[PDB]
Amino acid sequence: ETQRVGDILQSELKIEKESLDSFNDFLNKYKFSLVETPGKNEAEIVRRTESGETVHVFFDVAQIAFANVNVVISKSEPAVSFELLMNLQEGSFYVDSATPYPSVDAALNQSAEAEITRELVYHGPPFSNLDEELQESLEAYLESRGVNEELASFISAYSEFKENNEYISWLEKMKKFFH
Amino acid sequence: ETQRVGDILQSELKIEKESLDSFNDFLNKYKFSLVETPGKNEAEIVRRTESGETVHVFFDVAQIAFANVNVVISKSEPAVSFELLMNLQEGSFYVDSATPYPSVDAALNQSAEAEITRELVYHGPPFSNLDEELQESLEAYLESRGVNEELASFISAYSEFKENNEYISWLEKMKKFFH
Amino acid sequence: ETQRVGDILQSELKIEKESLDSFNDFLNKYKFSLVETPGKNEAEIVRRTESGETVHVFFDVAQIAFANVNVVISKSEPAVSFELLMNLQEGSFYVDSATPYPSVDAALNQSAEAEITRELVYHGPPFSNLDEELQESLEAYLESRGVNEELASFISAYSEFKENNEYISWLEKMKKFFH
């Protein structure tokens, strides 16, 4: 019965609606902008570094709340997409792949054809197969660009926050259907 | 040798060509229309309920003959897509996800961009993470809309029927190639 | 530090740059043309047989260096796509599926919609479910068309060659980014 579903959604809504300053502190520390799209799983934060690089970090809040984290760094001009695995318990990152794309658009465009273009191109060897010194220098480069414990903490806590907001909107949409 | 393949296809064809009333009885009982597309894996049945809802049920005959069953219910206006897992031996269903879409088209359009749109949006939490009473009321709602043992029986038997027809057409197409 | 990454890439480049006749011997023996697209994972070889068939063989060099090998055989006019699994150690092939498409374009076009079209159509039953004599005659047909130990050897060695070239180009692109 639609009434029975509606009653439970109504009571769950009231409860669910019932640390922002930690988000603001971390984002402002690195001069991040948060790109927030309510209704979608992916969250994005973007900043510009002292050396003129643009750093994008993408994560899937539903996957989190090992997770896939995409760090894209550009200097139109070439960008490297680092696909990372983040340990949710440890707050640690591991490089899975690093792919040099000819532009930020090539790295990030969500169109069907842009995805196919990414699928077809070489993504570098398994990271574990690289020279150890190459592995290390790339990890230290990412670290120096803010891929660290503070970022992992933000990703975890912001994912918990956004997903709960997504859950609330979902409850609301369900309520409208079952009304 | 092409002749050797052709001989075996020819003999398999003759054998394979060598309960419809149960299909008709179940479909008519619920006032279903069957949407049958020969050559394709997916089968669709659709009906309108006493309360003016439209219920679509989709299943993949090749997967069946746990299976994925998509039940889409609409009232242009919002639709909820219930993604179910069906126990093939038991004839039982389990809710994996329920996603409210803003229209039937958004839920069902097979275009590349429509699929991408579905992939990007929030699909609700894991069903197991919902309040137990919410889980139950949604399951009972689906039951009341004909997601039951009779539907599971139809899905199993119709999948066996259609797949065998697909196998026959496949044999025929192979025969033409090897001629 | 970008300098530290650049140094290691520079030294790896110098080392990596530091049997072609076996490629030429096998390709020429079967009158293959190699279709080589630097920067992409997939390699393609294509020939025309004595009976006027066109045989395409596709493989993913990154997957190789069990691998997926697609053998497409045409006579505009219908083509059968054989999806094979190749044992990398044994140099042996196993048929996973054989799908008759109405044209080479339908079988091979890489567009988003062409992929969706392939995903939706019936792919024949599990190969293991076929009559044993049908399984055998299809395997012997592929053999007679050059799906053999020589082809497996080429696929393995050419995959090693191309992937290393892809690795070199990747190092070069990384060098440019970190400069």
Q: What is the DSSP letter of B129?
A: G
Distance from C-alpha of A179 to C-alpha of A158, rounded to nearest angstrom: 31
- Which positions in chain C have a beta carbon within 8 angstroms of at least one beta carbon in chain A? 1-2, 4-5, 7-9, 12, 39-42, 62, 110-112, 115, 163, 166-167, 169-170, 173-174, 176-178
Beta strands C79-87 and B79-87: pairing type? Answer: unpaired
Bridge partners for C80 per DSSP: C73, C100
State the resolution, in angstroms: 2.1
Chain B CB contacts of C100 under 8 Å are 170, 173-174, 176-177
CA distances from C164 to A108, B141, C24 (A): 26, 58, 18
Task: Read off the tokens for C117.
Answer: 């079209």
Contacts of B134 (CB under 8 A, 6+ apart): A5, A8, A9, A12
B55 CB-near residues (< 8 Å, 6+ apart): B46, B47, B48, B49, B71, B72, B73, B145, B146
- A106: which residues sit within 8 A by CB, 6+ positions away? A79, A114, A117, A118
The rounded distance, in Å, linking the Cα atoms of C86 and C152 is 8
Q: Which residues pair with B67 in a beta bridge?
A: B86
What is the torsional sign of CA C101, C104, C108, C114? negative
Q: Rg of the Cα trace of chain B?
A: 19
* Measured distance CA(A71)–CA(C1) in Å, rounded: 17
DSSP string over C108-123: H--SHHHHHHHHHB--
Q: What does the alpha-carbon distance between residue A105 and residue C82 come to, in Å, rounded to a whole number?
A: 35
Contact between B152 and B92 (Cβ < 8 Å): yes
Strands in B24-149 per DSSP E? 33-35, 42-48, 54-60, 67-74, 79-87, 92-101
- The minimum CA-CA distance between A45 and chain B, rounded to whole Å, is 17
Cα maximum dimension of chain A? 63
C84 alpha-carbon distance from chain centroid = 10
Contact B152, B93 (CB under 8 A): yes
Q: Which residue of B has its CA nearest to C138?
A: B5
Residues near B135 by beta carbon (within 8 Å), at least 6 away in sequence: B95, B127, B128
Q: To probe the interface with A, which of B55, B77, B109, B137 has the most A CB atoms within 10 Å?
A: B137
Farthest-apart Cα atoms in chain B, separation: 63
* Residue found by looking up tokens 């707050």 in the block: A91
**Do the Cβ atoms of A100 and C176 come within 8 Å?**
yes
For residues C160 and C62, the answer to whether their CB atoms sit within 8 Å is no
Touching subunits of A (3+ CB pairs, under 8 Å) are B, C
Which helix (H) or strand (E) is C135 found in, with range? helix C132-144
Cα separations in angstroms, A135 against A146, B170, C8, C153: 17, 50, 10, 32
Residue of B nearest to A175 (CA): B100
List the helix and strand counts (H, then E) for chain B: 7, 6
Query: Kind of pairing, strands B42-48 and B54-60?
Result: antiparallel
Cα–Cα distance between C167 and C155 in angstroms, integer? 18
Instruction: Classify burial at A41, counting beta carbons within 10 Å of its beta carbon; exposed 0-12, middle 13-18, buried 19 or more.
Output: buried
Shortest CA gap B133–chain A (Å): 7
3-class state of residue C140 by DSSP: helix
C115 contact residues in A (CB cutoff 8 A): 116
**Interface partners of B (3+ CB pairs, < 8 Å)?**
A, C
Q: Measure the CA–CA gap between B10 and B26, rounded to whole angstroms.
A: 35
Q: Which of C116, C122, C131 sits opposite B110 (nearest CB)?
A: C116
Distance CA C54, CA C22 (A): 23
Alpha-carbon span A59 to A70, nearest angstrom: 7
Q: In 3-state terms, what secondary structure has residue B72?
A: strand
Chain B nearest C-alpha distance from A133 (Å): 37
**Cross-chain Cβ contact C122/B9 below 8 Å:** no
- Method used experimentally: X-ray
Question: In order of start, what are the domains of chain A with their CATH numbers?
Answer: 1-179 (3.10.280.10)
Determine, for residues C173 and A78 on separate chains, whether the beta-carbon distance falls below 8 Å. yes
Distance between CA A166 and CA B129 in Å, rounded?
14
Residue C98 tokens read as 């054989």
Chain B residues touching residue C116 (CB < 8 angstroms): 110-112, 115
Which CB contacts under 8 angstroms, 24+ apart, belong to C166-169?
A: C166/A122, C166/C38, C166/C39, C166/C41, C166/C61, C166/C62, C167/A124, C167/A125, C167/C16, C168/C13, C168/C16, C168/C17, C169/A122, C169/C38, C169/C39
SS (H, E, C) chain A: CHHHHHHHHHHHHHHHHCCHHHHHHHHHHCCCEEECCCCECEEEEEEECCCCCEEEEEEEHHHHCCEEEEEEEECCCCEEEEEEEEECCCCEEEEEEEEEECCHHHHHCCCHHHHHHHHHECCCCCHHHCCHHHHHHHHHHHHHCCCCHHHHHHHHHHHHHHHHHHHHHHHHHHHHHHC
Quickly tell me which residue has 């190459």 as its tokens: A134
How far CA A73 is from CA of A45, A52, A94, C74, in Å, comes to 12, 10, 16, 45
Q: Give me the residues paired with residue C57 across strands.
A: C45, C71
CB distance C32 to C56 below 8 Å: no
Distance, in Å, from the CA atom of B79 to the CA atom of A145, rounded to the nearest integer, reads 44
Q: Is residue C82 classed as helix, strand or coil in its secondary structure?
A: strand
Smallest CA–CA distance, residue B174 to chain A, in Å, is: 30
What is the distance between the alpha carbons of residues A68 and A57, in angstroms, rounded to a whole number? Answer: 11
Query: Interface of chain C against chain B, CB under 8 Å?
Result: 75, 78, 80, 98, 100, 112-113, 116, 120-125, 131, 133-134, 137-138, 140-141, 144
3-state secondary structure at position B37? coil
Residue A159 and residue A153: Cα distance in Å, rounded? 10
Binary contact (A174, B133; C-beta < 8 A) = no
Chain C: partners with 3+ C-beta pairs within 8 Å: A, B
Closest CB to B62: pick one of C113, C122, C141: C122
Indicate the burial class of C30 (C-beta count within 10 angstroms; 0-12, 13-18, 19 or more): middle
Cα→Cα distances B115→A55, A112, B125, C103, C116, Å: 28, 9, 20, 25, 10
Please answer whether residues B59 and B38 qualify as being in contact, where contact means their C-beta atoms are separated by less than 8 angstroms.
no
> What is the distance between the alpha carbons of residues B94 and B97, in angstroms, rounded to a whole number?
9
CB-based contact A162:B85 (threshold 8 Å):
no
User: What span, in angstroms and rounded, lies between the C-alpha atoms of C55 and C46?
Assistant: 6
State whether residue B127 is helix, strand or coil: helix
Among B3, B20, B9, which Cα is nearest to B170's? B9
Partner-chain contact B8 C116, CB within 8 Å:
no
List the structure tokens of C169.
């180009």
Q: Distance between CA B20 and CA B31 in Å, rounded?
A: 16
Strand, helix or coil for residue B4: helix
Tokens describing residue A20? 């922002």
User: Is the Cβ pair C100, B174 closer than 8 Å?
Assistant: yes
Find the residue in C nearest to B10 (Cα): C134
A151 contacts A91 by C-beta, under 8 angstroms: no
B131/A12 CB distance under 8 A: yes
From CA C102, how far away is CA C79, in angstroms rounded? 6
Number of other residues whose CB lies within 10 A of the CB of residue B117: 15
- What's the burial of B109, exposed, middle or buried (CB within 10 Å: 0-12/13-18/19+)? middle
Quote the Cα angle for B2-B5-B9, to 5°. Answer: 135
A68 has which bridge partners? A85
Contact B167 C124 (CB under 8 A): yes
Sign of CA dihedral C103, C107, C110, C116: positive
Rounded CA separation C174/C160 (Å): 21
CB contact under 8 A, A113 and C112: yes
